[PDB]
Amino acid sequence: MAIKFNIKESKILNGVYIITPNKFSDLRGDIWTAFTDEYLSNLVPNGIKFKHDKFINSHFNVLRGIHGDVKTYKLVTCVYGEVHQVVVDCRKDSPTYLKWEKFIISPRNQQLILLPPNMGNSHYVSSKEAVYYYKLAYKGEYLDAPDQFTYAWNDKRIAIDWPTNSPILSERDILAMN
Amino acid sequence: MAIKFNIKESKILNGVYIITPNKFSDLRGDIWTAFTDEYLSNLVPNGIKFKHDKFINSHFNVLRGIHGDVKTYKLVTCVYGEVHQVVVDCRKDSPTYLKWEKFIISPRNQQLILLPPNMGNSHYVSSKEAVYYYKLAYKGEYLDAPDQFTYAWNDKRIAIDWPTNSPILSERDILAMNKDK
Numbered sequence: 137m138a139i140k141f142n143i144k145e146s147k148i149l150n151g152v153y154i155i156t157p158n159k160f161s162d163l164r165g166d167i168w169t170a171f172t173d174e175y176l177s178n179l180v181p182n183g184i185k186f187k188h189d190k191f192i193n194s195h196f197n198v199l200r201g202i203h204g205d206v207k208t209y210k211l212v213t214c215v216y217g218e219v220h221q222v223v224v225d226c227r228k229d230s231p232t233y234l235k236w237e238k239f240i241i242s243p244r245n246q247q248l249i250l251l252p253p254n255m256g257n258s259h260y261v262s263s264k265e266a267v268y269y270y271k272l273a274y275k276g277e278y279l280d281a282p283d284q285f286t287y288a289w290n291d292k293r294i295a296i297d298w299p300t301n302s303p304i305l306s307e308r309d310i311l312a313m314n
Numbered sequence: 315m316a317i318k319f320n321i322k323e324s325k326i327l328n329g330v331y332i333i334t335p336n337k338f339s340d341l342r343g344d345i346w347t348a349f350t351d352e353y354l355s356n357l358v359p360n361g362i363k364f365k366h367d368k369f370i371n372s373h374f375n376v377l378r379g380i381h382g383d384v385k386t387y388k389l390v391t392c393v394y395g396e397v398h399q400v401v402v403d404c405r406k407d408s409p410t411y412l413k414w415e416k417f418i419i420s421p422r423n424q425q426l427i428l429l430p431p432n433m434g435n436s437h438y439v440s441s442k443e444a445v446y447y448y449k450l451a452y453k454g455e456y457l458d459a460p461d462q463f464t465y466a467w468n469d470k471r472i473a474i475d476w477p478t479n480s481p482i483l484s485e486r487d488i489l490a491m492n493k494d495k
């Protein structure tokens with residue numbers, strides 16, 4: 137079985153890609169390739185390279201977001217459990233400024249979503265627990281919280297469909313409400 | 315909290331490295347960094363790049379191994395549940411040929427292991443379900459099952475301590491037991 141990906145651009149947000157890998161499934165479970173340079177590196181222009189791998193473990197009803205920065209490309213998926221992955225267009229000069237797109241991602245719907253820079257990244261844990269896998273492509277230093285922007289999960293201009301009005305939020309994401 | 319890695323060489327097998335990251339924990343759960351080029355690309359020789367990420371989801375009592383090949387560096391961990399990760403030295407001309415080391419890896423013990431080429435890679439699932447993550451660094455094309463070597467999980471020369479005598483096995487890993495039958 138050769139390593140494969142189905143690759144398509146979003147019909148809703150320009151620059152967002154939906155990447156679906158094949159899987160070898162047997163009685164032991166499943167094997168799959170999330171990324172290779174040769175297959176996926178050509179999706180990111182101007183010399184910017186994936187150089188950073190992160191994992192985020194979270195409980196049911198947790199919502200992290202909406203976070204973004206001016207330079208980082210992100211490739212995101214859920215490798216255990218299930219998340220409501222929401223991409224928001226945070227490019228003020230974009231015609232789809234504050235439009236959004238939801239992908240319900242799990243091992244049964246194993247999409248990886250590519251976000252260009254200046255986009256809003258968020259996810260809501262709809263399983264008892266979830267593992268979010270997160271590859272970052274950027275020049276220079278990692279932009280931690282102080283060098284990221286934040287939109288409120290419940291911003292009335294974006295009007296995202298979320299399965300709750302009382303998510304488990306961090307101080308940063310609560311303070312974005314006011 | 316800045317991203318941190320602790321790197322130390324195995325006390326048992328030359329060239330095997332044990333990587334330990336920090337984690338930010340709070341009411342939502344845990345954030346951590348498995349890899350950055352800046353901190354971990356030196357693990358592997360210059361000219362050779364981590365260019366390939368794989369996930370392997372397995373059920374309790376599955377054992378995959380013992381597998382390796384002539385060119386592939388592997389960085390391995392378990393990002394959900396728990397595995398008995400066992401590195402075997404399969405370098406014929408090494409003073410530790412067919413010695414082994416076990417790492418019980420889980421989110422509670424978040425260790426990543428660097429295997430150089432010509433080592434046996436193996437893991438046993440001790441959790442209900444596990445997710446195994448590994449990065450591959452190699453030149454040229456991926457060596458699939460037909461261009462790899464296999465030692466039996468229960469090879470009497472290696473004599474690994476496993477929690478089972480009857481694991482769930484692939485065709486490949488059963489046939490490796492039958493070589494001198």
Ligand SMILES: Nc1nc2c(ncn2[C@@H]2O[C@H](COP(=O)(O)OP(=O)(O)O)[C@@H](O)[C@H]2O)c(=O)[nH]1
Pocket residue numbers: 137138139140158159160167168169368370378379381458459484486
């Ligand atoms: N689609 C897909 N198939 C793969 C991948 N890796 C391995 N395979 C196939 O999965 C099968 C089992 O491979 P093997 O290396 O023996 O797996 P292991 O026993 O878990 O280490 C083989 O038929 C491979 O060609 C992958 O990343 N994606």
Ligand SMILES: Nc1nc2c(ncn2[C@@H]2O[C@H](COP(=O)(O)OP(=O)(O)O)[C@@H](O)[C@H]2O)c(=O)[nH]1
Pocket residue numbers: 190192200201203280281306308315316317318336337338345346347
């Ligand atoms: N050790 C470690 N801490 C991190 C990492 N990423 C973020 N943090 C810290 O975790 C906290 C939350 O950061 P934030 O980006 O707001 O997380 P989010 O709310 O999950 O999107 C901050 O203290 C960061 O400094 C990491 O990869 N490793």
Ligand SMILES: [Cl-]
Pocket residue numbers: 297298299300
């Ligand atoms: Cl909803």
